[PDB]
Design an enzyme around this catalytic site. Structure first.
Site, PDB file in Angstrom:
ATOM      1  N   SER B 201      35.569  43.231  32.169  1.00 44.67           N
ATOM      2  CA  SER B 201      36.931  42.999  32.619  1.00 44.67           C
ATOM      3  C   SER B 201      37.808  42.840  31.391  1.00 44.67           C
ATOM      4  O   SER B 201      37.772  43.673  30.487  1.00 44.67           O
ATOM      5  CB  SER B 201      37.005  41.744  33.491  1.00 44.67           C
ATOM      6  OG  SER B 201      38.229  41.689  34.204  1.00 44.67           O
ATOM      7  N   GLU B 330      35.289  48.401  42.720  1.00 47.31           N
ATOM      8  CA  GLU B 330      36.056  47.646  41.735  1.00 47.31           C
ATOM      9  C   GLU B 330      37.247  46.918  42.350  1.00 47.31           C
ATOM     10  O   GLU B 330      37.637  45.851  41.860  1.00 47.31           O
ATOM     11  CB  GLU B 330      36.534  48.581  40.622  1.00 47.31           C
ATOM     12  CG  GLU B 330      35.434  49.032  39.670  1.00 47.31           C
ATOM     13  CD  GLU B 330      35.044  47.948  38.675  1.00 47.31           C
ATOM     14  OE1 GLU B 330      35.772  46.938  38.582  1.00 47.31           O
ATOM     15  OE2 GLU B 330      34.014  48.105  37.985  1.00 47.31           O
ATOM     16  N   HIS B 443      33.702  43.670  41.865  1.00 48.90           N
ATOM     17  CA  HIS B 443      33.967  43.553  40.439  1.00 48.90           C
ATOM     18  C   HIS B 443      33.340  42.282  39.871  1.00 48.90           C
ATOM     19  O   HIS B 443      33.531  41.187  40.406  1.00 48.90           O
ATOM     20  CB  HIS B 443      35.477  43.552  40.213  1.00 48.90           C
ATOM     21  CG  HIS B 443      35.882  43.341  38.791  1.00 48.90           C
ATOM     22  ND1 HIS B 443      36.085  44.386  37.915  1.00 48.90           N
ATOM     23  CD2 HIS B 443      36.135  42.209  38.095  1.00 48.90           C
ATOM     24  CE1 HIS B 443      36.442  43.906  36.738  1.00 48.90           C
ATOM     25  NE2 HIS B 443      36.479  42.586  36.821  1.00 48.90           N
TER      26      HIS B 443
END
Ligand SMILES: *[C@@H]1O[C@H](CO[C@@H]2O[C@@H](C)[C@@H](O)[C@@H](O)[C@@H]2O)[C@@H](O[C@@H]2O[C@H](CO)[C@@H](O)[C@H](O)[C@H]2NC(C)=O)[C@H](O)[C@H]1NC(C)=O
Ligand SMILES: *[C@@H]1O[C@H](CO[C@@H]2O[C@@H](C)[C@@H](O)[C@@H](O)[C@@H]2O)[C@@H](O[C@@H]2O[C@H](CO)[C@@H](O)[C@H](O)[C@H]2NC(C)=O)[C@H](O)[C@H]1NC(C)=O
Ligand SMILES: *[C@@H]1O[C@H](CO[C@@H]2O[C@@H](C)[C@@H](O)[C@@H](O)[C@@H]2O)[C@@H](O[C@@H]2O[C@H](CO)[C@@H](O)[C@H](O)[C@H]2NC(C)=O)[C@H](O)[C@H]1NC(C)=O
Ligand SMILES: *[C@@H]1O[C@H](CO)[C@@H](O)[C@H](O)[C@H]1NC(C)=O
Ligand SMILES: *[C@@H]1O[C@H](CO)[C@@H](O)[C@H](O)[C@H]1NC(C)=O
Ligand SMILES: CCN(CC)/C(C)=N/[P@](C)(=O)OC
Ligand SMILES: CCN(CC)/C(C)=N/[P@](C)(=O)OC
EC number: 3.1.1.7
Lengths: 530, 534
Positions: B201, B330, B443
């Site tokens: 991330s 995601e 995610h």
């Protein structure tokens, strides 16, 4: 003499001819004058009704073809010559043809009226592929076709002027429709059951009569094959029509205002105008034609798109459809790398160049949007996929998505719509295999040409032609193509159901390229306005 | 007395560590090593200063404080959100790093893995249980380093051009830790000439920015970017928008008693309690949205001489190996933070009206025409109103726009310009996952497998998942050692701009596929920028 081939219409007496068919004779009345010859001072003017005549008009042979360009891309090739004029060219060309059963019907018989295509620059009612004898014998209707002015003679417009108001080729069709209302009963036809059908620019003509109130009362049902009035090619704006008319005058040496410009154009032989017709287009392109209907507030009080959106279509039944590969035919007229004589396996550079000729007069950004939607980014340079993609671009932009928009709007606004995709490649097709089922090659089946013993269609194709003639004539008789067998459901904006037409039984499918047509009909207009 | 393996001397002084127990054997851990002077009081918003040398022995025996940050309150007590929340006290005194090394210390120089956590540049900590480095070091015999860096306004509030608050100081915290690794990792048995950055991330976006900053590029040799890229629409901000956000934050907390002299504005901001700044952090965003964060790296000509996209396109990347990838879903995690109709506690079967509204929240600050292009592409015009397809479409919108397509653009440019790239898609949904089924593989939920968390006896992973984690740890360590995740067995091919090959990571053996959502990412990476320019 044969009393069955003597007819008296409002203007005088006619003498027809008896035609042979593998199923029995039909009566034909060919070359009936319905307008005064639009010659000399009457060039570019609206048509006048034919003045009455004495004696008997010989209506046994097709009349002259309206003056038009003659294709020269493949001289002697069957695939192109079948659309070229098969009769002498003349501005004296406003004649129509009537086919009736033999003996002539004694009961009012439903009437089918055919409007040929040809990009508004060409076409004739005398072409072999439009021969109405097989339809009339098999399905027992009256069949009418007319010649109408094309090219500059039918659609050159100096908007606002009285010497060249534009759309006179469309008024030629309307006058023939008025002739049908007044005289078709003398042939056994029913003027209260008239179905218009046409292909390509003929389909666009049919749709324009739907949206013009003075034409709307002259017929009751409509069939639009591979064409629509709302396409990017079927109409032109007033300013661009004036620019094209003005450039044509310059190219032919005129002037030596509108009154004078048109007067000089009227002195030029017909071929001189034809010889410069293609040079008034703004750019190198395909599927674009110089002199087409103009939106000037008269014949069309607004753009066909606006008229379709604002119309009440309850009580209207329409039959619309397309062929499987609408775009392939036009690619050989200018897309780089395309030819009938090889596989046309183009490169990405040719594909990108081909997008600009297939989507002409469009901003760079909108062209990029086309390339985005029609590229397979897992195989961005595969020649076979690019050849097919450019065929889809030209076909979706010009035919499929304009037809899909028309069908969805008419259905969502009260009309009963039946939609089809024509997916049979004729065994006799002279075009290469990579073109698939090209534009215009469903007509010969609709007219029952495979029933001709002189031709080499298979027995299965003869059955297929009889199937199609029954669908079309059922729709003309009742507004429903179905035989009261797999059933043909109406097209709706939600379900988007259509049928495939080929040798197999009817198969119901969903969506006329719904993904692609969302791009052309919903997004692309929004981009062009910003 | 003392254990010689837990005593090491760095440039700043002596340190004392602890012996960690793992299912596979002991590991040495040095947790809470100070690498900077505490950025408190007058040092708030300033670049970090190196830690001054100390006498005596510093006890590096436990994780230090978490850098002051917002604490998530969306689902209080929910395992799926609490695992990302601070597990130590909040403090601005937070610039500490951690070193894990095998026990006994390696005799020869050992490749080093440096972890940079994510958290949208507003949150995160190296102390989170999911970043526990004991299993990686034990299984693969590497040295692992992780650092804390300032987040939120404390790390990325920028008044560009001012020396009081230059911006990007959170990135300078990472760079200083990387400089510390170069100077000191050999004292732990690490090889400073074999250093692999990896992060997820915002950590992955941080890794990418170090790749594009010359002063940082010399401190490492390999990079791993998990579900993130520096070129995303959320990871950087322009100079004027950074100043507008900073000026608005100061205004909301009473500074000055709007704008004006930068020195006085920052001096007023430094008198505010840290929690007061955090209480107004989210109110400076220009629009309601998801996947957008208030204080992020700023493109000011210094750390980044240009936008990450321009630096990527103009960069020569020969001699560099990169491993990039994404999870299968995601976008789903971010949708419950603001897209209408979404919740972890129901199926989130939204309507078409909620889908259209969600497009503006998921693609904020774009023209109406640009939003229309998004709707055209992500609508199935044969099923334009089916709730299930709309839910998955909005998840794809947010995921492609913010992660997948930014990652794909980076991977393609790096490969075409001399770097060797390996790409993956992580497709295994952990059996212990607490998020609902409709979110798929969300995610951030590959991290626990890469760190070998399933090997923890206290947890309840299946035996297959423990084998899976051991395979993933081997891929990562093979890449760290050799620049190639393959074992020196199904083969992992390099990613290229043409073939675009990647592998799926799950319980089945490696499967090679083509295209990271190629059709979708052509829209985001090729067409949409041309639309925004007109
Ligand atoms: C397929 O043919 C086209 C057109 O070539 C025409 O048809 C051939 C059978 C032959 O008679 C040619 O002489 C004709 O010109 C090719 O496109 C042309 O390519 C040539 C170069 O070879 C170029 O000079 C022309 O401008 C091109 N014409 C157009 C309309 O773009 C095409 O390359 C062929 N495809 C292949 C070989 O895969
Ligand atoms: C912006 O203001 C700073 C700081 O101003 C000082 O602090 C205020 C609280 C007030 O007491 C002022 O009178 C002070 O001057 C300016 O930086 C200072 O400039 C003056 C003159 O050189 C002097 O105080 C020091 O050099 C600086 N002190 C600092 C930096 O704390 C700065 O010049 C101002 N900028 C502009 C554009 O006006
Ligand atoms: C699905 O849930 C969302 C969120 O509602 C919350 O979660 C539920 C599981 C339940 O715990 C509720 O009490 C919570 O409020 C729903 O979206 C909300 O709907 C309400 C009422 O219409 C509205 O006031 C809120 O603004 C909505 N919130 C958001 C973020 O849009 C949604 O309607 C549920 N979908 C269903 C039940 O089909
Ligand atoms: C058109 O132009 C001619 C020549 O200039 C002029 O004599 C004539 O009056 C004009 N007609 C109209 C209707 O303007
Ligand atoms: C694993 O499950 C056991 C019960 O079988 C439970 O007591 C324990 O807390 C769980 N461990 C976790 C969730 O980490
Ligand atoms: C008559 C059918 N043809 C020729 C194949 C055309 C061009 N029809 P339409 O006018 O296409 C614009
Ligand atoms: C650490 C993983 N998480 C929380 C799920 C996030 C938000 N990572 P990233 O910074 O997203 C922009």
């Amino acid at each position: 003499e044969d009393a069955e081939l003597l007819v008296t219409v409002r203007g005088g007496r006619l003498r027809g001819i008896r035609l042979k068919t593998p199923g029995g004779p039909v009566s034909a009345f060919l070359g009936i004058p319905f307008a005064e010859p639009p010659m000399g001072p009457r060039r570019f003017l609206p048509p006048e009704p034919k003045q009455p005549w004495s004696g008997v008009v010989d209506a046994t042979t097709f009349q002259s073809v309206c003056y038009q360009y003659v294709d020269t891309l493949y001289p002697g090739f069957e695939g192109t010559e079948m659309w070229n004029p098969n009769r002498e060219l003349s501005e004296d060309c406003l004649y129509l043809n009537v086919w009736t059963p033999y003996p002539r019907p004694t009961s009012p018989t439903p009437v089918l009226v055919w409007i040929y295509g040809g990009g508004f620059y060409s076409g004739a009612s005398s072409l072999d592929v439009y021969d109405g004898r097989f339809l009339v014998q098999a399905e027992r209707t009256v069949l009418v076709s007319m010649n109408y002015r094309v090219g500059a003679f039918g659609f050159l417009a100096l908007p606002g002027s009285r010497e060249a108001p534009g759309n006179v080729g469309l008024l030629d069709q309307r006058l023939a429709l008025q002739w049908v209302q007044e005289n078709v009963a003398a042939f056994g036809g029913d003027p209260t059951s008239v179905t218009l059908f046409g292909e390509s620019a003929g389909a666009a003509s049919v749709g324009m009569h739907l949206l013009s109130p003075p034409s709307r009362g002259l017929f009751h049902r409509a069939v639009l094959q591979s064409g629509a009035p709302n396409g990017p090619w079927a109409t032109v704006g007033m300013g661009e029509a004036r620019r094209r008319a003005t450039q044509l005058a310059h190219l032919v040496g005129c002037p030596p205002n509108d009154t004078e410009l048109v007067a000089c154009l009227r002195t030029r032989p017909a071929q001189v105008l034809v010889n410069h017709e293609w040079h008034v287009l703004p750019q190198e392109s395909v599927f674009r034609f110089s002199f087409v209907p103009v939106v000037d507030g008269d014949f069309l009080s607004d753009t066909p798109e606006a008229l379709i959106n604002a119309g009440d279509f309850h009580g209207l039944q329409v039959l619309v459809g397309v062929v499987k590969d609408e775009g392939s035919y036009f690619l050989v007229y200018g897309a780089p790398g395309f030819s009938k004589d090889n596989e046309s396996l183009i490169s990405r550079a040719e594909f990108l160049a081909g997008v600009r000729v297939g989507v002409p007069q469009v901003s760079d950004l909108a062209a990029e949007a086309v390339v985005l939607h029609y590229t397979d980014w897992l195989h961005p340079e595969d020649p076979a996929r690019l050849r097919e993609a450019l065929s889809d671009v030209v076909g979706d932009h010009n035919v499929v998505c304009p037809v899909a928009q028309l069908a969805g709007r008419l259905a969502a606004q009260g009309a009963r719509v039946y939609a089809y995709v024509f997916e049979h490649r004729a065994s006799t097709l002279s075009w290469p295999l990579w073109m698939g089922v090209p534009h215009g090659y469903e007509i010969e089946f609709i007219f029952g040409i495979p029933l001709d013993p002189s031709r080499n269609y298979t027995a299965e194709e003869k059955i297929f032609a009889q199937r199609l003639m029954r669908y079309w004539a059922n729709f003309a008789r009742t507004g429903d193509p179905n035989e009261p067998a797999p059933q043909w459901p109406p097209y709706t904006a939600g379900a988007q159901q259509y049928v495939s037409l080929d040798l197999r039984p009817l198969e119901v499918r969903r969506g006329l390229r719904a993904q692609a047509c969302a791009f052309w009909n919903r997004f692309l207009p929004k981009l062009l306005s910003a």
